[PDB]
C-alpha cells in the first residue's frame, strides 16, 4: 500500500516530421542545352517542419554540377557532355529521396539515344529511345530484312525486331541531326552438350 505519493509532470510538443511524407515539384523534368543554368523548384508535402539536401548522379556533368540550395529550391548548371542525369532531393538524414530527371541534349537542336550497342537473340525484340529538340524523329535500318525498326506514336521511341542473325547498324533522327546505334543479332542456341563421347555398343 502506498502510504505517501507525490507526482511530477512534464509537457512534450511533438512536431510533425513532414518530408518523411514525400516532397513534390513544379520542376519534375527539365531538358536543357549544353551550358544553360536553369533554376529548379520543389516543396515538402503539408509545408511542415524539416529541411532538404540536393544531390546529383555523376557530378561531372557541370562545372560544379548542382549549386547548393537556398531554402527548399536550388539551381542547376552544365558542361560539354551529353545524355540524361538525375538530381535527387534527399531529406536531411532520413529516407525520403525525390528525383528530378534532366537531359543535356548535346547541342541546340541535336540528339542522343539510350543504348549505344544492343545484343538481341534472333526472333527477339527490344526498344530504343531518342531525346531531341524537335518531335519528328524518323527511324531507318540497313538490312530491313534482318532487323526491322518500327516507331511508336511519340516518334522518339521505336521497337526493334531481330528478323535475322548478324551485325547490323541503326540511324535515327532525320531532324537535322542523325544519331547512331550498333545492333548484333545472336543465335537462339550458342552450343550444345551430350552425355557421351566414348560409348560402346
Amino acid at each position: 500500500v502506498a502510504t505517501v505519493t507525490k507526482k511530477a509532470s512534464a509537457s512534450i510538443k511533438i512536431y510533425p516530421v513532414v518530408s518523411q511524407i514525400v516532397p513534390k515539384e513544379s520542376t519534375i523534368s527539365m531538358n536543357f542545352n549544353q551550358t544553360k543554368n536553369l533554376e529548379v523548384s520543389l516543396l515538402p508535402a503539408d509545408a511542415n517542419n524539416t529541411n532538404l539536401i540536393w544531390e546529383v548522379s555523376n557530378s561531372s556533368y557541370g562545372s560544379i554540377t548542382v549549386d547548393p540550395s537556398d531554402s527548399k529550391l536550388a539551381t542547376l548548371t552544365s558542361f560539354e557532355k551529353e545524355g540524361n542525369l538525375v538530381v535527387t532531393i534527399s531529406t536531411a538524414n532520413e529516407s525520403v529521396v525525390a528525383q528530378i530527371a534532366v537531359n543535356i541534349i548535346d547541342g541546340d537542336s541535336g540528339i542522343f539515344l539510350s543504348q549505344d550497342t544492343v545484343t538481341i537473340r534472333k526472333g527477339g525484340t527490344t526498344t530504343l529511345t531518342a531525346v531531341t529538340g524537335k518531335t519528328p524523329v524518323t527511324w531507318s535500318s540497313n538490312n530491313a530484312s534482318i532487323v526491322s525498326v518500327t516507331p511508336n506514336a511519340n516518334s522518339l521511341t521505336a521497337v526493334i525486331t531481330a528478323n535475322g542473325e548478324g551485325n547490323v547498324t541503326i540511324t535515327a533522327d532525320n531532324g537535322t541531326k542523325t544519331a547512331s546505334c550498333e545492333i548484333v543479332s545472336i543465335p537462339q542456341i550458342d552450343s550444345i552438350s551430350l552425355s557421351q563421347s566414348d560409348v560402346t555398343v
Binding site: 502510504t3 505519493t5 509532470s9 509537457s11 512534450i12 511533438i14 516530421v17
Partner: protein
C-alpha cells in the same frame, strides 16, 4: 517529499527519441509509475523504472507524468471461511476474496495490484460534460469468459458511503490485449465523448447469494442454489450477452462444486449430483450413493464442499469435511470419487485439503540428472522417498497437489501411505494406506 523531473518541456520530431528521469526529494528507495495523459503518441519501456525512453509516433501535444510512492506492507484478512478464488486471464493471475478488492498480477509485473479500472463509473452533466469517479466495489468471486472477466454478488458503493449489497448483480469487462488484463468496468463508457464495453443485468430468481459461475462451450452457466441461467454472448449489439433461464430446481451447493468434465457440467446441486449437457440433466447418484452423501456432508460443514477434475485418471471427485470433525473446520478429510469413463463411484481419504490443483513438481522429481546431487549423499539427509521411476499419469509428467491444513503441501495420488492427524498429541502420523 517533493519530486523533481530532469525536464519540464521538450520538442520532438516524429520518430525521435528522448529520455527523462525522476528523482525523489530524500535519497530513499520508492516505487514509480510513469503515465501519459493521451493514448497513442508515444512508445515506452518499463513504466516502473526511474528513467523512461520515449518515441514520438503522431503529431500533437501531451503531458508525461511520474507518480512516486512510499509503499509499505499491509496484511490481507482473507480468513479460512472466506478463501482466495483465483481465476486466470491472458497469463495474468487474479486473487479475489471477500473484504478485499479483487487484485491481479500482470504478466509483465512481479507484484499484485488492484484490478485496473475496477470501481470506475462515469457521470455526464446536462449539456454533456463527462467525469469519471471511482467508488468502492467489493466482490465475492471472479472468473473468465469470452476474453472478458466477470464478477458476482457485488457490494457496490456510491457517493455518500452507504454501500449496498446487490446479491443478483453480475458485471463484465472489456476484451483483453497483449499480455494484459481487462482495462475498464464502467457500464457508462462511451459518454466520455477497443471493444466490448461493460454491463450488468441484476437477475430475477431466488434469495440470490449467487454462488458460482462457469462456462461451457461459449455458454455461461450462472448458479443460485436454487435455479440457474444460461448466458449467451451475442456478437456486439444492444445486448452484449443475452441471459436465458435454464432450470427451476437445479442450483449449485457451494462456491466451487461445478466442473467441466466432458462437454458437460458436473454439479452438487443441493439435493444430489447431476451431469448436464446444457438443455437437459441427469442424476449421477439417483439411487446408488445419494442417501450416503447428503448424510456424510450434512453432518459437519457442507459449504466446505469442492469438486476437482482428476483428468489424468478420468475421475471427478467431490471433497468434503469428514463425519467427525470440528463444526468450524473447512479441511476436507474425505472425497467421493466418480470415474466418468465407466460411471462408477468410490470414496477415499485426502490429507486435510484446504485446496487442490494440478501442478508441476519439484526438480528432484522432475526427471533429473546424476549431475544435480553434487551436494547430496546416499545417506538420506531426511530425504528418502525417491523411487528411480515413479509411475506416470501424464506425459508432461505433472502432479495433483493439495494445500493442507497440516502446515504444508501434499501430493494426493502417489505410492501407498496415509497422513492421519492426532489432536490428543498435536502431532501428525504416517500409516500404511488401507483399502477396504
Amino acid at each position: 517529499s517533493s519530486v523533481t523531473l530532469d525536464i519540464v518541456s521538450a520538442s520532438l520530431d516524429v520518430g525521435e527519441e528522448i529520455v527523462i528521469t525522476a528523482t525523489a526529494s530524500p535519497e530513499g528507495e520508492y516505487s514509480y509509475q510513469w503515465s501519459v495523459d493521451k493514448t497513442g503518441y508515444v512508445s515506452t519501456t518499463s513504466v516502473t523504472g526511474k528513467s523512461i525512453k520515449l518515441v514520438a509516433l503522431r503529431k500533437g501535444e501531451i503531458n508525461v507524468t511520474c507518480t512516486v510512492s512510499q509503499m509499505t506492507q499491509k496484511d490481507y484478512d482473507a480468513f479460512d471461511d472466506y478463501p482466495w478464488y483465483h481465476a486466470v486471464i491472458s497469463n495474468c493471475a487474479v486473487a479475489t476474496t471477500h473484504y478485499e478488492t479483487p487484485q491481479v498480477k500482470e504478466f509483465e509485473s512481479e507484484y499484485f495490484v488492484d484490478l485496473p479500472g475496477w470501481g470506475e463509473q462515469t457521470v455526464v452533466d446536462n449539456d454533456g460534460n463527462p467525469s469519471v469517479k471511482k467508488f468502492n466495489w467489493k466482490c465475492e468471486r471472479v472468473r473468465s469468459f469470452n476474453n472478458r472477466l466477470f464478477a458476482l454478488n457485488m457490494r457496490e458503493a456510491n457517493a455518500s458511503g452507504v454501500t449496498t449489497n446487490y446479491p443478483l448483480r453480475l458485471r463484465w469487462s472489456n476484451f483483453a490485449n497483449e499480455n494484459k488484463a481487462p482495462t475498464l468496468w464502467d457500464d457508462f463508457a462511451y459518454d466520455r465523448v477497443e471493444n466490448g464495453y461493460a454491463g450488468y443485468i441484476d437477475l430475477a430468481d431466488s434469495n440470490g447469494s449467487l454462488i458460482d459461475i462457469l462456462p461451457l462451450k461459449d455458454y455461461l452457466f450462472v448458479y443460485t442454489e436454487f435455479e440457474t441461467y444460461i448466458g449467451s454472448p451475442t456478437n456486439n449489439t444492444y445486448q452484449p450477452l443475452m441471459f436465458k433461464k435454464l432450470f427451476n430446481d437445479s442450483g449449485i451447493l457451494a462456491p466451487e462444486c461445478v466442473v467441466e468434465v466432458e462437454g458437460s457440467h458436473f454439479v452438487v446441486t443441493q439435493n444430489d449430483v447431476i451431469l448436464h449437457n446444457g438443455a437437459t440433466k441427469k442424476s449421477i447418484a439417483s439411487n446408488r450413493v445419494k442417501n450416503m452423501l447428503i448424510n456424510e456432508v450434512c453432518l459437519v460443514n457442507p459449504l466446505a464442499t469442492r469438486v476437482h477434475l482428476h483428468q489424468d485418471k478420468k475421475e471427478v471427485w467431490v471433497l468434503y469435511v469428514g463425519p467427525g470433525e470440528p463444526k468450524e473446520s473447512f479441511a476436507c478429510t474425505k472425497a467421493a470419487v466418480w470415474n466418468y469413463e465407466f460411471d462408477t463411484w468410490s470414496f477415499r481419504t485426502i490429507p486435510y485439503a484446504q485446496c487442490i490443483g494440478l501442478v508441476d513438481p519439484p526438480v528432484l522429481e522432475r526427471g533429473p540428472i546424476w549431475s544435480d546431487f553434487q551436494e547430496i549423499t546416499w545417506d538420506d539427509p531426511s530425504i528418502k522417498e525417491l523411487v528411480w521411476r515413479k509411475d506416470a499419469t501424464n506425459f508432461r509428467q505433472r502432479v495433483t497437489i493439495v494445500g493442507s491444513f497440516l502446515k504444508g503441501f501434499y501430493q494426493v495420488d502417489v505410492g501407498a501411505l496415509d497422513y492421519f492427524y492426532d489432536r490428543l498429541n498435536d502431532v501428525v502420523i504416517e500409516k500404511p494406506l488401507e483399502m477396504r
